[PDB]
Write a protein that binds this ligand. Structure first.
Ligand SMILES: N[C@@H](Cn1cc(Br)c(=O)[nH]c1=O)C(=O)O
Ligand SMILES: N[C@@H](Cn1cc(Br)c(=O)[nH]c1=O)C(=O)O
Ligand SMILES: [Zn+2]
Ligand SMILES: [Zn+2]
Ligand SMILES: [Zn+2]
Lengths: 258, 258
């Protein structure tokens, strides 16, 4: 049985090739996770079909209905067999799906235009002339919602009631907002993404300060999946072979344009 | 029943308290992993007994005898129920025991006596005046033994054949060797340990270059253990609540001597 892989369009993890018009199936896509999927499938010995998550979300549980959305939801309800994407390993998700050991390490970071008078999270929390937000239905927004750290909690009380909404549906929207806000908007996002964007023209953004936390991305499978064990050992093998480092250089700096 | 925890004397994870002869049981020890063990036990709801691994090793399988030694061996043969220490999550180990998601991220790094003209692994491999080695019998040594990467294999070729041995029995032994070498010995060790030593008197060592790889430490349990699931969720909860960052600051920098 062909394995249904759920993923999300997030550069440089999964992007449609420039010549996708003449391509079909998994060939239409390219990116870090596309290469990863091929490796995993090869080592675990299975055939697969890459599918972009229906609602374009990573995964969160509806407080009122208790229904899971995003890629997590597709695994939970059996719409997909495995998720290969920049999906953060978290406690709430681990309670409903399985995660392989991390294939990438990262942390929340700050993205600023360039010339923006901000160097840390504390700086952002000390002023109000510059707005800031995060992505939606993701671990970043949840981080601030659950954080007890003085600075992070203060930032949340602002973002929560901010008008207009400082949250964005997609990373692209957030980066675009930073670039066109004359430096009046800072974006909080996962470090790996921040670093990628800093190497993309117009080369007008930059990562400032250290990461606010430590976390990792993992390959997810529904609980009780016959793929779980094999996939986990596959990720470890690939990391130990140095393939994962090989893949990040390829998509992050070998293609950098700054 | 009381849970038997195997761990290892490796500063600052587990250390003998100054007046340990005056104390009993778990109170004889102090450190990052001692603090972590208490927290894992509280959150998982079990009583425990800290024990220091008999052979003072982390864990490897002897080719020929097929017997596992170190903390891994204590779990494999049922001498301990859980291992809470700076134990690296590796494929070969994952095949015989279970690991929680990582509680600490790190990579192999280079430690030099201040002033040593070395800035990378490539630098080390391209010269011979400066000797270098690793902790014997651990995942760092195995990384070089198993690596297929040119630079790292070249380093392995030299280290395995060096006489006298460039390998050391304990981290302290390696650090002392760097300190007494007048710059003629560099030490390859896990990054977080390198960082710890850099903050200890006489403040004569430092970490140089980037990490050679990326991996993490995990809490280990025997396969099929009834504790596995709970321990994993506890680690994720503790990381998300910021405790792990708190513990590193406490044992690394709050007590920094440089
Ligand atoms: N990895 C997250 C999604 N995600 C992604 C990016 Br990029 C970001 O900046 N913030 C997030 O929460 C998850 O798994 O929810
Ligand atoms: N973490 C390793 C042990 N270990 C420890 C230190 Br500190 C080091 O520098 N190298 C190692 O291999 C393992 O699990 O074998
Ligand atoms: Zn391969
Ligand atoms: Zn709702
Ligand atoms: Zn606690």
């Amino acid at each position: 049985k062909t394995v249904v892989v759920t993923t999300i369009l997030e550069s440089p993890y999964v992007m449609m090739k420039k010549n996708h018009e003449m391509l079909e199936g998994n060939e239409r896509y390219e990116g870090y996770c596309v290469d990863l999927a091929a490796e995993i499938a090869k080592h675990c010995g299975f055939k697969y079909k890459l599918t972009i998550v229906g609602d374009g979300k990573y995964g969160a549980r509806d407080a009122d209905t208790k229904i899971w959305n995003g890629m997590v939801g597709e695994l939970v309800y059996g719409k997909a067999d495995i998720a290969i994407a920049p999906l953060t390993i978290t406690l709430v998700r681990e309670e409903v799906i399985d995660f392989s050991k991390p294939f990438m390490s990262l942390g929340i970071s700050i993205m600023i235009k360039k010339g923006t008078p901000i160097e840390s999270a504390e700086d952002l929390s000390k002023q109000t002339e510059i707005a800031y937000g995060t992505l939606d239905s993701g671990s970043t927004k949840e981080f601030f919602r659950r954080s007890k750290i003085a600075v992070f909690d203060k930032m949340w009380t602002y973002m929560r009631s901010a008008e207009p909404s400082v949250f964005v549906r997609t990373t692209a929207e957030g980066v675009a907002r930073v670039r066109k806000s004359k430096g009046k908007y800072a974006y909080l996002l996962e470090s790996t993404m921040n670093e990628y964007i800093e190497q993309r023209k117009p080369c007008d953004t930059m990562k400032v300060g250290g990461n606010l936390d430590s976390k990792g991305y993992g390959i997810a499978t529904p609980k009780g999946s016959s793929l779980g064990n094999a996939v986990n050992l596959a990720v470890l093998k690939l990391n130990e072979q140095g393939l994962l480092d090989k893949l990040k250089n390829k998509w992050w700096y070998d293609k950098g344009e700054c």
